[PDB]
Structures are given as structure tokens and as C-alpha cells.
């Protein structure tokens, strides 16, 4: 049971290159609008305390170079929504999928299409951490890469990439340009809040290990919801809500293990450890699989 991303084809058909001055990053081309991080308009001087409204009014349409492969698109208008720049182009993208813009909740997962110079490079599954960072593979030039989920024929865009933090995690915005977390698109070293582990996902992953015939960590003991949550919070795990319990039902039924029985197992793991053992190959409890992710696979 391994990490699985959504097929990326519908998003690849939307990726373009956006250049301003010496700065090049990725944009998302939907209908006749290209969305990208606004810091593309910055220079080295600008980056430490950029007054974006000032920097933007000083720009004209012709200062933006948008390339779809070898083809230049003509920018006929530009505006800013929070931290995203929107470039109107004279051409519509025929490859535009059915889509929506969503803001995801912490603990939810999405796929990331990592792009450089407008070209797709890799795809992988991320979780929005409780402290609103994401543990990604993003290098120089990845800005403007997007995260998404696919439901039926519909792409829900939830993330656009903007920056790295000193710890090596990453930060960005929704497609309305609002950051996830307390971060700012300026060139400073920023720390996040204290991270916590996503408990409902750890429980989904234990159920997955059981479904894969793997149960050394199970026990006959049980716990109340509140007593589990006391121990969880002691270990900087998120408390488990009753909707979380509800959401775990299908995995509960399928294995015949009551949610609160699995909570008692997790409690024992937190207090004791894995004592050399592994679960699904891992020496660590994994919290980037949602119940939905587990079920569908």
C-alpha cells in the first residue's frame, strides 16, 4: 500500500511559462486567464519588502512573457488577487478541463504537479499539515506549480506553490491567492507554528496495514474517545472528532475493528513505540493518507 497521485494529464495541458524581467516561473492557463504567483514581478531588491501594488502599477502587459511551449501568448490585461497575478491572454486554452477552485482543510491530501519552466516534471501526493505547511519536493523554479484533486471529470485546484521555509517544508496559496498559514510572499526566513500529527489519517493507515494482513500492533484493549484524545494531545496528535470517527466507519466495518479499538492500539504505539518493528515497511506512523485515500486503494 503506497502513495498514489491523481492522473495529471488534465493539469499538464494547462501549464505555461511566465517570465518578467529575469524571473521565470510557472503559470496555470484556464480559458483565457493565466494564474501565477505575483512575486514574479519582483527583482532582487524588491524581494525583501515588496510593495506589490506599487510594483504592479509600474508594469504593463508587454512586460509579461507567457509561453505555451514554443508559442507566445499575448497578454491583453493583468490584475492581482491577493498573492496571485492574473494575466488575461487573447487565446483560450482548448485543453481547459472542467474545474473549480477550492480551499482545502488541514489534514486533507492533494496531488502536486511539480513543473519547471512551464514543463511538467513529476507528480506526487501531499498533505496540508496542521500548521499549514506541505512536505514537498519543490526546487528553484517550481513556483506556480499547482495542487489538485479530481472528482469525476472535474479538477479541484487547491494549491499554488510560492516558497520554502528554512526547515525544508513548503508554503503557498489557494487559487484565490490567500496563503495557507501565517506566511508571506517576501524573501525572509519564516517559521511555522508547531506541527501536529494528523490522527484520523494515522488511524486510516493502521486500518490499511490490517487490510494488508498486518496486525502485530492490535490489542484487545479499548478506550473512550476523550481518554484517547487526552493521550493524543499529550503527544502532539490532533484530537479525534466524532465526524472523524464517523468517516472511519467503512474501514471499521471492512476489518471488524471498532474505531475506538484502533484508537487503543494507537495509544499503545504512542506510549511504547514500535520497538524495532515496522508497519507497512515504515519505522514511523504515517499521517498523509486520508480515509478516502485508503478506501479507494
Ligand X SMILES: *[C@H](O)[C@H](C[C@@H]1CCNC1=O)NC(=O)[C@H](CC(C)C)NC(=O)OC[C@H]1C[C@H]2CC[C@@H]1C2
Q: Which residues bind a second copy (CB under 8 A)?
A: 1-10, 12-13, 113-114, 120-125, 135-137, 168, 212-213, 278, 282-284, 296-297
Distance CA 229, CA 227 (A): 5
187 binds, among ligand X, a second copy, none (CB under 5 to 8 A by kind): ligand X
Candidates 122-130, 135-143, 208-216, 270-278 — which segment interacts with ligand X by CB under 6 A? 135-143
**Please, how many CA atoms are within 13 Å of residue 236, restricted to the half-sphere of its CB?**
8
Residues with active-site annotation? 39, 143
Residue of 17, 93, 111, 142 interacting with ligand X (CB under 6 A): 142
Q: Can residue 85 be called a binding residue for ligand X (CB under 6 A)?
A: no
Burial environment of residue 44 by CB neighbours within 10 A (0 to 12, 13 to 18, 19 or more):
exposed
Give the binding-site size for ligand X (rule: CB under 6 A): 20
**Which residue lies nearest ligand X, judged by its C-beta?**
143
The β-bridge partners of 21 are none
User: Which of the residues 42 through 81 are near ligand X (CB under 6 A)?
Assistant: 42, 47
Tell me the closest approach of the beta carbon of residue 137 to a second copy, in angstroms. 5
Give the whole-angstrom CA distance, residue 96 versus residue 114. 18
**143: number of CA atoms within 13 Å, CB side?**
24
- Distance from C-alpha of 197 to C-alpha of 238, rounded to nearest angstrom: 6
Task: Indicate whether 38 belongs to the interface with ligand X (CB under 6 A).
Answer: no
If one asks whether residue 121 binds ligand X (CB under 6 A), the answer comes out as: no
* Residue 114 binds which entry of a second copy, ligand X, none, CB below 5-8 Å type-dependent: a second copy
Return the ∠ at Cα 159 (arms to 184 and 135), rounded to 5°. 75
Amino acid at each position: 500500500f503506497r502513495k498514489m497521485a491523481f492522473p495529471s494529464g488534465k493539469v499538464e495541458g494547462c501549464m505555461v511559462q511566465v517570465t518578467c524581467g529575469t524571473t521565470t516561473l510557472n503559470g496555470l492557463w484556464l480559458d483565457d486567464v493565466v494564474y501565477c504567483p505575483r512575486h514574479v514581478i519582483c527583482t532582487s531588491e524588491d524581494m525583501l519588502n515588496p510593495n506589490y501594488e506599487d510594483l504592479l502599477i509600474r508594469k504593463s502587459n508587454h512586460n509579461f512573457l507567457v509561453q505555451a511551449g514554443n508559442v507566445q501568448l499575448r497578454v491583453i490585461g493583468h490584475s492581482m488577487q491577493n498573492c496571485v497575478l492574473k494575466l488575461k491572454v487573447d487565446t483560450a486554452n482548448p485543453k481547459t478541463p472542467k474545474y473549480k477552485f477550492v480551499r482545502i482543510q488541514p489534514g486533507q491530501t492533494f496531488s502536486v504537479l511539480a513543473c519547471y519552466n512551464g514543463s511538467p516534471s513529476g507528480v506526487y501526493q501531499c498533505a496540508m499539515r496542521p500548521n499549514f505547511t506541505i512536505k514537498g519536493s519543490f526546487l528553484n523554479g517550481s513556483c506556480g506549480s499547482v495542487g489538485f484533486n479530481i472528482d469525476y471529470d472535474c479538477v479541484s485546484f487547491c494549491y499554488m506553490h510560492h516558497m520554502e521555509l528554512p526547515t525544508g517544508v513548503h508554503a503557498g496559496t489557494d487559487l484565490e491567492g490567500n496563503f495557507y498559514g501565517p506566511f508571506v510572499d517576501r524573501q525572509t526566513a519564516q517559521a511555522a507554528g508547531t506541527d501536529t500529527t494528523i490522527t484520523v489519517n494515522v488511524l486510516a493507515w493502521l486500518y490499511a496495514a490490517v487490510i494488508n494482513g498486518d496486525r502485530w500492533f492490535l490489542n484487545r484493549f479499548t478506550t473512550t474517545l476523550n481518554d484517547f484524545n487526552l493521550v493524543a494531545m499529550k503527544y502532539n496528535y490532533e484530537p479525534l472528532t466524532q465526524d472523524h470517527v464517523d468517516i472511519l466507519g467503512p474501514l471499521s466495518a471492512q476489518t471488524g475493528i471498532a474505531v475506538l479499538d484502533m484508537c487503543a492500539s494507537l495509544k499503545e504505539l504512542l506510549q511504547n513505540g514500535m520497538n524495532g518493528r515496522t508497519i507497512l515497511g515504515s519505522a514511523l506512523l504515517e499521517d498523509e493518507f486520508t480515509p478516502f485515500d485508503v478506501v479507494r486503494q
